C-alpha cells in the first residue's frame, strides 16, 4: 500500500476538492473549491509563435542508444526540472492506480525530450512533485500529452500541477477526423507496434521490471515526432491554432473528488440488475451500496476492493440473516467486510418483515 508512505494522508470525505499548489517560485498556496487556480493565467496565455510555423520533423531516437534516466530522489527530480527548462517542447504521460485507493493515485510520470527519456517515480517523490511547477507553468514550453483528460485531473489531485500550453495529440487526430489512440499514432507515423499487455498492470510495484520500464518509456519516446507530424497535417488543412485552443480548454478542467449521491449513485451502478426486486430488496440494495462507499472512503480502497458490485446485489436478493450467510454473498471477502459483517447483517435485519 503506497498510501502508508504518504507524507500527507488522503482526505476521502464527501467535501469538495480544495487544491494545495505551488507556483514557479516554489511558493505554497491554498486554493478554493470549484476554482482552477491557474484559470486566469491559462486564459491570458498565447501559443508560442515558433510552434505555429511549418517546420521539418525531428525523428524519434533509437531505443538502443537513447539515454533513459529513472528519477526517484528529490535532487534527481530538481536536476530533471532544469534540463526540461532548456526545451521548447516535452512529451508527458502518466501511469495510475485505482483499485486499492478510493480516489486513486498517480504512480509514474514519463517525460521525453528530443534528446532523451525520463521515468519519474511519483510515489517515491510524491511530496516533491510541486518542484515541476516551473516547467508545467512555463508558457514557452509546450507540454505534449496524448489523450490528457484523466492526466490533467490526476496532476491536480496528486501534486497541485497545472499545464500552461498543453497540446493534446489525441485532440489533433479527432480534429483531422482520424483514429486517435496512442498505439494508432505510433503505428501510423512511426510504424512501431506498442505493447498492449501493460496498460492494466499494477504500477504501484517497486522495482519496476524491465518490460514495464520499456512500456513506460515508449509511451512518450515517439510523442514529439508524432507532435511534429500532426502539426504539419493541421497546417495542411487555422486548424493548428484550433487544436491548441481545444487543448487549452482541456487544461482548464478541474479534478473533483468522487461524488456519492445517496439517492442516485446506487441506481447508476446497479442499473438493470435492480429489476425483479421487492421494495425491501431495493432498500437493502441502496443501503449496502451506500455502506460500501462509506467503508471504501475509510479503508482508502475503491468500492470494488471493498465488495464486488454483484455481491451488493447478492445481499439484496438473498437477504442473509447470519454473519456466515453475509460472508457467502461477499466472496471474495475483504477485510472491510469481515470486520464490519455485523453492520451489513444489521442493514438486512432492519429491512426484513414489514417496513
Author numbering: 179 to 415, 423 to 540
Publication excerpt:
The exosome is a 3′–5′ exoribonuclease complex that plays a central role in numerous pathways related to RNA processing and degradation, both in the nucleus and in the cytoplasm. Rrp6 is composed of an N-terminal PMCN2NT domain which was shown to interact with a cofactor Rrp47, the EXO domain containing the catalytic active site, an HRDC (helicase and RNAseD C-terminal) domain, and a C-terminal region responsible for the interaction with the exosome. The EXO domain consists of a classical α/β fold composed by a six-stranded β-sheet flanked by α-helices and the HRDC domain is constituted of six α-helices.
The electron density map revealed the presence of a disulfide bond between the residues C496 and C515, linking α-helix 3 and the end of α-helix 4 of the HRDC domain. In order to study the effect of the disulfide bond disruption on the protein structure and activity, site directed mutations were introduced in the cysteine residues generating the variants TbRRP6CAT-C496S and TbRRP6CAT-C595S. Similarly to TbRRP6CAT the residues 416 to 423 could not be modeled. Superposition of TbRRP6CAT and the mutant TbRRP6CAT-C496S structures resulted in an RMSD of 0.51 Å for 352 C-alpha atoms aligned. In the oxidized protein, the short turn that follows helix 4 moves away from helix 3 for the SS bond formation. The mutants TbRRP6CAT-C496S and TbRRP6CAT-C595S, lacking the SS bond, were also assayed against double-stranded RNA and showed activity comparable with the constructs with native cysteine residues.
